[PDB]
Design a protein around this nucleic acid. Structure first.
Ligand SMILES: CN(CC[C@H](N)CC(=O)N[C@H]1C=C[C@H](n2ccc(N)nc2=O)O[C@@H]1C(=O)O)C(=N)N
Ligand SMILES: [Mg+2]
Ligand SMILES: [Mg+2]
Ligand SMILES: [Mg+2]
Ligand SMILES: [Mg+2]
Ligand SMILES: [Mg+2]
Ligand SMILES: [Mg+2]
Ligand SMILES: [Mg+2]
Ligand SMILES: [Mg+2]
Ligand SMILES: [Mg+2]
Ligand SMILES: [Mg+2]
Ligand SMILES: [Mg+2]
Ligand SMILES: [Mg+2]
Ligand SMILES: [Mg+2]
Ligand SMILES: [Mg+2]
Ligand SMILES: [Mg+2]
Ligand SMILES: [Mg+2]
Ligand SMILES: [Mg+2]
Ligand SMILES: [Mg+2]
Ligand SMILES: [Mg+2]
Ligand SMILES: [Mg+2]
Ligand SMILES: [Mg+2]
Ligand SMILES: [Mg+2]
Ligand SMILES: [Mg+2]
Ligand SMILES: [Mg+2]
Ligand SMILES: [Mg+2]
Ligand SMILES: [Mg+2]
Ligand SMILES: [Mg+2]
Ligand SMILES: [Mg+2]
Ligand SMILES: [Mg+2]
Ligand SMILES: [Mg+2]
Ligand SMILES: [Mg+2]
Ligand SMILES: [Mg+2]
Ligand SMILES: [Mg+2]
Ligand SMILES: [Mg+2]
Ligand SMILES: [Mg+2]
Ligand SMILES: [Mg+2]
Ligand SMILES: [Mg+2]
Ligand SMILES: [Mg+2]
Ligand SMILES: [Mg+2]
Ligand SMILES: [Mg+2]
Ligand SMILES: [Mg+2]
Ligand SMILES: [Mg+2]
Ligand SMILES: [Mg+2]
Ligand SMILES: [Mg+2]
Ligand SMILES: [Mg+2]
Ligand SMILES: [Mg+2]
Ligand SMILES: [Mg+2]
Ligand SMILES: [Mg+2]
Ligand SMILES: [Mg+2]
Ligand SMILES: [Mg+2]
Ligand SMILES: [Mg+2]
Ligand SMILES: [Mg+2]
Ligand SMILES: [Mg+2]
Ligand SMILES: [Mg+2]
Ligand SMILES: [Mg+2]
Ligand SMILES: [Mg+2]
Ligand SMILES: [Mg+2]
Ligand SMILES: [Mg+2]
Ligand SMILES: [Mg+2]
Ligand SMILES: [Mg+2]
Ligand SMILES: [Mg+2]
Ligand SMILES: [Mg+2]
Ligand SMILES: [Mg+2]
Ligand SMILES: [Mg+2]
Ligand SMILES: [Mg+2]
Ligand SMILES: [Mg+2]
Ligand SMILES: [Mg+2]
Ligand SMILES: [Mg+2]
Ligand SMILES: [Mg+2]
Ligand SMILES: [Mg+2]
Ligand SMILES: [Mg+2]
Ligand SMILES: [Mg+2]
Ligand SMILES: [Mg+2]
Ligand SMILES: [Mg+2]
Ligand SMILES: [Mg+2]
Ligand SMILES: [Mg+2]
Ligand SMILES: [Mg+2]
Ligand SMILES: [Mg+2]
Ligand SMILES: [Mg+2]
Ligand SMILES: [Mg+2]
Ligand SMILES: [Mg+2]
Ligand SMILES: [Mg+2]
Ligand SMILES: [Mg+2]
Ligand SMILES: [Mg+2]
Ligand SMILES: [Mg+2]
Ligand SMILES: [Mg+2]
Ligand SMILES: [Mg+2]
Ligand SMILES: [Mg+2]
Ligand SMILES: [Mg+2]
Ligand SMILES: [Mg+2]
Ligand SMILES: [Mg+2]
Ligand SMILES: [Mg+2]
Ligand SMILES: [Mg+2]
Ligand SMILES: [Mg+2]
Ligand SMILES: [Mg+2]
Ligand SMILES: [Mg+2]
Ligand SMILES: [Mg+2]
Ligand SMILES: [Mg+2]
Ligand SMILES: [Mg+2]
Ligand SMILES: [Mg+2]
Ligand SMILES: [Mg+2]
Ligand SMILES: [Mg+2]
Ligand SMILES: [Mg+2]
Ligand SMILES: [Mg+2]
Ligand SMILES: [Mg+2]
Ligand SMILES: [Mg+2]
Ligand SMILES: [Mg+2]
Ligand SMILES: [Mg+2]
Ligand SMILES: [Mg+2]
Ligand SMILES: [Mg+2]
Ligand SMILES: [Mg+2]
Ligand SMILES: [Mg+2]
Ligand SMILES: [Mg+2]
Ligand SMILES: [Mg+2]
Ligand SMILES: [Mg+2]
Ligand SMILES: [Mg+2]
Ligand SMILES: [Mg+2]
Ligand SMILES: [Mg+2]
Ligand SMILES: [Mg+2]
Ligand SMILES: [Mg+2]
Ligand SMILES: [Mg+2]
Ligand SMILES: [Mg+2]
Ligand SMILES: [Mg+2]
Ligand SMILES: [Mg+2]
Ligand SMILES: [Mg+2]
Ligand SMILES: [Mg+2]
Ligand SMILES: [Mg+2]
Ligand SMILES: [Mg+2]
Ligand SMILES: [Mg+2]
Ligand SMILES: [Mg+2]
Ligand SMILES: [Mg+2]
Ligand SMILES: [Mg+2]
Ligand SMILES: [Mg+2]
Ligand SMILES: [Mg+2]
Ligand SMILES: [Mg+2]
Ligand SMILES: [Mg+2]
Ligand SMILES: [Mg+2]
Ligand SMILES: [Mg+2]
Ligand SMILES: [Mg+2]
Ligand SMILES: [Mg+2]
Ligand SMILES: [Mg+2]
Ligand SMILES: [Mg+2]
Ligand SMILES: [Mg+2]
Ligand SMILES: [Mg+2]
Ligand SMILES: [Mg+2]
Ligand SMILES: [Mg+2]
Ligand SMILES: [Mg+2]
Ligand SMILES: [Mg+2]
Ligand SMILES: [Mg+2]
Ligand SMILES: [Mg+2]
Ligand SMILES: [Mg+2]
Ligand SMILES: [Mg+2]
Ligand SMILES: [Mg+2]
Ligand SMILES: [Mg+2]
Ligand SMILES: [Mg+2]
Ligand SMILES: [Mg+2]
Ligand SMILES: [Mg+2]
Ligand SMILES: [Mg+2]
Ligand SMILES: [Mg+2]
Ligand SMILES: [Mg+2]
Ligand SMILES: [Mg+2]
Ligand SMILES: [Mg+2]
Ligand SMILES: [Mg+2]
Ligand SMILES: [Mg+2]
Ligand SMILES: [Mg+2]
Ligand SMILES: [Mg+2]
Ligand SMILES: [Mg+2]
Ligand SMILES: [Mg+2]
Ligand SMILES: [Mg+2]
Ligand SMILES: [Mg+2]
Ligand SMILES: [Mg+2]
Ligand SMILES: [Mg+2]
Ligand SMILES: [Mg+2]
Ligand SMILES: [Mg+2]
Ligand SMILES: [Mg+2]
Ligand SMILES: [Mg+2]
Ligand SMILES: [Mg+2]
Ligand SMILES: [Mg+2]
Ligand SMILES: [Mg+2]
Ligand SMILES: [Mg+2]
Ligand SMILES: [Mg+2]
Ligand SMILES: [Mg+2]
Ligand SMILES: [Mg+2]
Ligand SMILES: [Mg+2]
Ligand SMILES: [Mg+2]
Ligand SMILES: [Mg+2]
Ligand SMILES: [Mg+2]
Lengths: 98, 76, 134, 181, 44, 30
RNA sequence: CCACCAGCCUACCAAACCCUGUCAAACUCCGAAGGGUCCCAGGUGGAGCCUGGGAGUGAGGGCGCGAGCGAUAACGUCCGCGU
RNA sequence: AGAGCGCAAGGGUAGAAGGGGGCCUGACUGCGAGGCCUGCAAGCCGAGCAGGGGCGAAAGCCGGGCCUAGUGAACCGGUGGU
RNA sequence: UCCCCCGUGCCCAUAGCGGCGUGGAACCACCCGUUCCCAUUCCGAACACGGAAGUGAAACGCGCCAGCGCCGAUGGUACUGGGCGGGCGACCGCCUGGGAGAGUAGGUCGGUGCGGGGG
RNA sequence: CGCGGGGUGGAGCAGCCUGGUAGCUCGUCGGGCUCAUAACCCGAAGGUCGUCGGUUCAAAUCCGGCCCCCGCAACCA
RNA sequence: CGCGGGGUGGAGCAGCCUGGUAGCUCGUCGGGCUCAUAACCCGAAGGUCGUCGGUUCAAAUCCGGCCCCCGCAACCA
RNA sequence: AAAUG
């Protein structure tokens, strides 16, 4: 079901990989072609509150802070096995503000 | 004797080997299906024709369960 | 049989694979010269053995004629020979084991197999069972 | 709605009883009802879709749940089949929707049956799952005689979590399945 | 059956191929003329 | 939705289903 | 023998499957020698490349080798590599 | 993966090219670096630029169909437009 | 620097199937609920949202066994650039350089890059 | 062997091109008219579509192979 | 390609003219007569008179477009 | 319109 991952790759660079647990959500921009992560704004496993979506937009902006500081811009969003919606969407909502 | 018949043989195959210089647009492989897959700087057309997307050297690669890939590692 | 269609001819390169080892009986008949063996040859050779030791042990044919043999109807030069006049034959390189008997003594086996030699278009040798088993 | 007999009967009676026979370390290892797929095979409705949509509302009504229209694949020329024209309603019951169904099935459907003597004991598919067929369809509660156009019953597939047969075999017995033994 | 898509409020055309008896009595797909830009086209 | 499964054989079961109109002549108790 | 039924099993016909043993131009889990091409190097040769003037040739043949056709016939025939 | 992929075979393919649904008509216009093949003429692949669009949140994808058959120089004339 | 888990890429079965055992602090899953966003040709199965109680059964992670699968030499042979010799032939033999497939001995219940979390 | 045509209830024919659905005449069989037979009248039965394989959801029907029958041809100067 | 006239019951067709009539023939069913068979006779079931729109109180009838068939004439790089 | 024993 990871067919989406393949598409995003052979396309550009800087994958915004996004995993999300039943009580968590993680995001890391990674430059493939060598397999290395640039920035990793973990969420529930970092410090944030309790509302999943509310948490998402926070980490989204959070990632943008540290990421854009290092000079980043390729919004190649790895919409994982998760349909673009709610939590994952809010995560995007965040970076789309930061 | 319903035989004695054929069809104009299409000169297909690997058109540019590994370690060759190529200009952008150069055809790398004309193939039946995807006997070779695209890759770094190598796109393919509706017929499966793999071609260079930029100038550089051509390098091949294999990946077993994943198949063989043609690349163009640039430098100029 | 069943298969599909008429075959090309093909050369008979070295006895490479063409060759085996006894594996069913006490004695064996083996080819020394290469050749296509007709079905009707297999037959005559086989019967020649059973015909010999009547109510005998067991015959083992180890080559099967799967090659379609072609032939023209006595004409000129076109199309491919419908042929099959001899029908089918099996390619046989030197060293290949043809027949094997069992359930009979030396004299029974020696004579019977020897008879097959005369039924075959080949110079042949009889074999015991040495001791060579892989 | 989430509260009635079979649910409780399973938790406050069946659940422990099973543990006494096989003694599971963990709670989940216990056999468990969780899926009931009703399915008619009205290939006859291939032509007239009148019977089709009707039995569809009969079916959805006896179950309360919405009905799905099954399609064809291959082609039984021997009985007018091609791509997917035909049909055979199929509803899948889980959670309470299932329980409420099994309530009527065990206390009303099964009861009034043209000569009932028990369910087939061999009908276990070698893995914690049972299957049974019904001829008449009006043996269900809200199916008056002046409503039936024709006898068009169906078959029900009950799914458990048990592995072995006799393991799930008991599970349905404790619930209320009158096996012929 | 050959077909050439005429433009509305004009008289442009486009290479095409209808299918007649098979479900096709009304062909009105979009296109884009050189005259002006972007317009709906009839069958004809 | 409630339901009055008034069995003819004394029993008077009760569960959930559309319309409380039920009158089973003989149910699981006869 | 047992027919309104049965299995080990039958010097009885056989799908599937298994063991032993094999076959295939149009079958390949494998797979050489070699062949092709590119890079670097040697190679000054009636080598090589570019532009133009002038051609002839377009019945070939034998031999070796690899195949088709033929009959594992023909000073046969048809291609391939070489002479 | 022995199915499927409209039809022959082949190559390819479930990490989709197969099956289902939503919206849509890029079976666009003006071009086209660079090449495959090649005696000529033809045939084939094509990134990218401009215009105006489609689907997608976006990265993006779309100049018909998984691909290789489904075809006919010129001449002469018909038709619509400039 | 060392161990465990989570996300991700690389090698592309020595990574697999199976069997046994182990982990819930954390992590992850399972799980609770269907009001809000979203969803079912039916079903909250799946996708989705809000989240405690429970569990490590399932799944997953880690660790063992070589039954299957998979990998697999050395030696020898086939075959063969090139150079020769022998028969009427179907063919056969030598020199020289290259050298399989099968089979034998054996190997294998993985290795590793980056980031994050926990001790 | 090559080109064309044809194998269908007992006999003689249609259906095939345009795949689903066995048609016609006679004969046969049971029952009626006759003293009886036939004629005539009323009913019914009977096919494996040569054969093997393939196509197709489905083959008398489309496709290929073999067998049988009919005509022509097999010049050879 | 243009021109001409056709679609009406199960089948063939008049009625179209010029608006108020759907008829005939065989066919199918019943009945009458019959050695039988037709012939004859009685009665009967069955047609948006191609399609969609239009003038009209009222058409299948006059009108427009169109579907399909039949025919006429011409052309074919 | 109606052949035969
Ligand atoms: C019988 N003829 C033939 C007259 C010719 N000018 C002369 C003649 O005899 N020609 C004949 C010459 C041989 C020729 N022939 C025969 C066999 C063959 N395999 N190939 C041939 O060419 O067939 C010819 C033939 O008879 O028509 C006439 N009525 N004209
Ligand atoms: Mg993920
Ligand atoms: Mg052919
Ligand atoms: Mg040819
Ligand atoms: Mg050729
Ligand atoms: Mg090129
Ligand atoms: Mg393209
Ligand atoms: Mg394509
Ligand atoms: Mg390499
Ligand atoms: Mg893989
Ligand atoms: Mg000797
Ligand atoms: Mg052995
Ligand atoms: Mg062996
Ligand atoms: Mg289903
Ligand atoms: Mg049907
Ligand atoms: Mg539930
Ligand atoms: Mg057409
Ligand atoms: Mg056409
Ligand atoms: Mg079309
Ligand atoms: Mg268009
Ligand atoms: Mg212009
Ligand atoms: Mg009997
Ligand atoms: Mg008896
Ligand atoms: Mg019985
Ligand atoms: Mg009986
Ligand atoms: Mg019986
Ligand atoms: Mg009996
Ligand atoms: Mg009896
Ligand atoms: Mg009996
Ligand atoms: Mg068998
Ligand atoms: Mg046998
Ligand atoms: Mg077998
Ligand atoms: Mg060959
Ligand atoms: Mg073939
Ligand atoms: Mg291979
Ligand atoms: Mg190997
Ligand atoms: Mg090699
Ligand atoms: Mg090599
Ligand atoms: Mg080289
Ligand atoms: Mg250079
Ligand atoms: Mg040099
Ligand atoms: Mg010099
Ligand atoms: Mg010079
Ligand atoms: Mg010279
Ligand atoms: Mg010279
Ligand atoms: Mg030069
Ligand atoms: Mg020149
Ligand atoms: Mg010159
Ligand atoms: Mg010149
Ligand atoms: Mg010249
Ligand atoms: Mg020439
Ligand atoms: Mg010559
Ligand atoms: Mg010539
Ligand atoms: Mg020459
Ligand atoms: Mg020569
Ligand atoms: Mg030669
Ligand atoms: Mg040679
Ligand atoms: Mg060969
Ligand atoms: Mg030979
Ligand atoms: Mg000779
Ligand atoms: Mg020769
Ligand atoms: Mg050749
Ligand atoms: Mg397989
Ligand atoms: Mg396939
Ligand atoms: Mg399909
Ligand atoms: Mg095939
Ligand atoms: Mg294929
Ligand atoms: Mg793939
Ligand atoms: Mg797809
Ligand atoms: Mg689809
Ligand atoms: Mg699709
Ligand atoms: Mg759709
Ligand atoms: Mg779609
Ligand atoms: Mg729809
Ligand atoms: Mg340029
Ligand atoms: Mg160019
Ligand atoms: Mg060009
Ligand atoms: Mg070229
Ligand atoms: Mg050219
Ligand atoms: Mg020229
Ligand atoms: Mg040109
Ligand atoms: Mg072409
Ligand atoms: Mg483009
Ligand atoms: Mg756009
Ligand atoms: Mg973005
Ligand atoms: Mg494009
Ligand atoms: Mg396309
Ligand atoms: Mg397609
Ligand atoms: Mg498509
Ligand atoms: Mg042409
Ligand atoms: Mg043509
Ligand atoms: Mg053409
Ligand atoms: Mg032209
Ligand atoms: Mg001319
Ligand atoms: Mg002109
Ligand atoms: Mg003009
Ligand atoms: Mg330290
Ligand atoms: Mg430290
Ligand atoms: Mg370090
Ligand atoms: Mg370490
Ligand atoms: Mg890791
Ligand atoms: Mg890597
Ligand atoms: Mg498994
Ligand atoms: Mg444990
Ligand atoms: Mg424990
Ligand atoms: Mg816990
Ligand atoms: Mg609860
Ligand atoms: Mg609530
Ligand atoms: Mg609500
Ligand atoms: Mg559906
Ligand atoms: Mg729906
Ligand atoms: Mg849930
Ligand atoms: Mg979920
Ligand atoms: Mg929770
Ligand atoms: Mg817990
Ligand atoms: Mg576990
Ligand atoms: Mg367990
Ligand atoms: Mg482990
Ligand atoms: Mg593991
Ligand atoms: Mg073990
Ligand atoms: Mg072993
Ligand atoms: Mg060594
Ligand atoms: Mg070795
Ligand atoms: Mg060696
Ligand atoms: Mg050598
Ligand atoms: Mg000599
Ligand atoms: Mg000789
Ligand atoms: Mg020789
Ligand atoms: Mg050597
Ligand atoms: Mg070596
Ligand atoms: Mg090797
Ligand atoms: Mg071997
Ligand atoms: Mg072997
Ligand atoms: Mg060894
Ligand atoms: Mg494991
Ligand atoms: Mg390992
Ligand atoms: Mg190890
Ligand atoms: Mg290792
Ligand atoms: Mg690392
Ligand atoms: Mg770290
Ligand atoms: Mg952690
Ligand atoms: Mg510590
Ligand atoms: Mg410590
Ligand atoms: Mg014929
Ligand atoms: Mg004819
Ligand atoms: Mg005939
Ligand atoms: Mg017939
Ligand atoms: Mg007949
Ligand atoms: Mg007959
Ligand atoms: Mg007739
Ligand atoms: Mg007829
Ligand atoms: Mg006729
Ligand atoms: Mg016909
Ligand atoms: Mg025909
Ligand atoms: Mg047809
Ligand atoms: Mg008759
Ligand atoms: Mg008679
Ligand atoms: Mg009679
Ligand atoms: Mg009388
Ligand atoms: Mg009489
Ligand atoms: Mg009599
Ligand atoms: Mg009949
Ligand atoms: Mg018949
Ligand atoms: Mg025939
Ligand atoms: Mg036939
Ligand atoms: Mg036939
Ligand atoms: Mg039929
Ligand atoms: Mg035919
Ligand atoms: Mg003669
Ligand atoms: Mg002569
Ligand atoms: Mg003559
Ligand atoms: Mg004209
Ligand atoms: Mg015309
Ligand atoms: Mg016209
Ligand atoms: Mg006129
Ligand atoms: Mg009137
Ligand atoms: Mg009258
Ligand atoms: Mg009638
Ligand atoms: Mg008459
Ligand atoms: Mg009359
Ligand atoms: Mg009317
Ligand atoms: Mg009317
Ligand atoms: Mg009307
Ligand atoms: Mg005429
Ligand atoms: Mg006229
Ligand atoms: Mg004209
Ligand atoms: Mg014409
Ligand atoms: Mg007489």
């Amino acid at each position: 079901k990871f067919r989406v991952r393949n598409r995003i790759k052979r396309t550009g660079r800087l994958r915004l990989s996004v995993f999300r647990s039943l009580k968590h959500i993680y995001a890391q921009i990674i430059d493939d072609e060598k397999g290395v992560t640039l920035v990793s704004a973990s969420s529930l496993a970092l410090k944030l509150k309790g509302n999943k979506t509310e948490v998402a937009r926070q980490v989204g902006r959070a990632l943008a802070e540290k990421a854009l500081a290092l000079g980043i811009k390729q919004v190649a969003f790895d919409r994982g096995p998760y349909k673009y919606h709610g939590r994952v969407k809010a995560l995007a909502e965040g970076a789309r503000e930061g | 004797t319903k035989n004695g018949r054929d069809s104009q043989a299409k000169r297909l195959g690997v058109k540019r080997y590994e370690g060759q210089v190529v200009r952008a647009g150069n055809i790398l492989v004309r193939q039946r299906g995807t006997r070779f897959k695209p890759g770094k700087n190598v796109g393919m057309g509706r017929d499966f024709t793999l071609f260079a997307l930029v100038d550089g050297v051509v390098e091949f690669q294999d990946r077993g369960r994943l198949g063989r890939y043609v690349h163009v590692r640039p430098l100029a | 049989r069943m298969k599909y269609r008429k075959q090309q001819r093909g050369r008979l390169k070295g006895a490479t694979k063409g060759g085996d080892y006894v594996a069913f009986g006490d004695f064996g008949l083996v080819a020394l010269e290469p050749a296509w063996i007709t079905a009707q040859q297999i037959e005559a050779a086989r019967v020649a053995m059973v015909r010999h030791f009547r109510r005998g042990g067991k015959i083992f044919i180890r080559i099967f004629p799967d090659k379609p043999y072609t032939k023209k109807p006595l004409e000129v030069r076109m199309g491919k020979g419908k042929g099959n006049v001899e029908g089918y034959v099996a390619v046989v390189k030197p060293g290949r084991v043809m027949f094997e008997v069992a359930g009979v003594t030396e004299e029974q086996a020696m004579e019977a197999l020897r008879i097959a030699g005369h039924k075959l278009p080949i110079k042949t040798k009889i074999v015991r069972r040495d001791a060579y088993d892989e | 709605p989430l509260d009635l007999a079979l649910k409780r009967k399973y938790y406050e009676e069946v659940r422990p009883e099973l543990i006494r026979r096989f003694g599971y370390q963990n709670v989940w290892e216990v056999p468990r009802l969780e899926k009931v797929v009703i399915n008619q095979g009205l290939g006859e409705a291939k032509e007239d879709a009148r019977i089709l949509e009707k039995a569809a509302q009969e079916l959805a009504l006896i179950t309360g749940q919405k009905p799905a229209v099954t399609r064809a694949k291959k082609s039984i020329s021997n009985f007018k089949l091609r791509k997917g024209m035909p049909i055979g309603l199929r509803v899948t019951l889980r959670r309470d929707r299932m329980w409420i169904f099994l309530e009527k099935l065990l206390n009303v459907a099964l009861p009034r049956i043209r000569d009932f003597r028990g369910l087939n004991p061999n009908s276990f598919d070698g893995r914690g799952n049972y299957n049974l067929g019904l001829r008449e369809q009006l043996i269900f509660p809200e199916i008056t005689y002046d409503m039936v156009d024709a006898l068009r019953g169906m078959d029900i597939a009950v799914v458990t979590t048990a592995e072995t047969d006799e393991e799930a075999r008991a599970l349905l017995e404790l619930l209320g399945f009158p096996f012929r033994k | 059956l050959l077909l050439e898509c005429t433009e509305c409020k004009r008289r442009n055309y486009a290479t095409e191929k209808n299918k007649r008896n098979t479900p096709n009595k009304l062909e009105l797909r979009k296109y884009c003329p050189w005259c002006r830009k972007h317009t709906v086209h009839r069958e004809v | 939705v409630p339901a009055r499964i008034i069995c003819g054989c004394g029993n008077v079961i009760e569960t959930y289903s559309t319309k409380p109109e039920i009158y089973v002549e003989v149910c699981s108790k006869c």
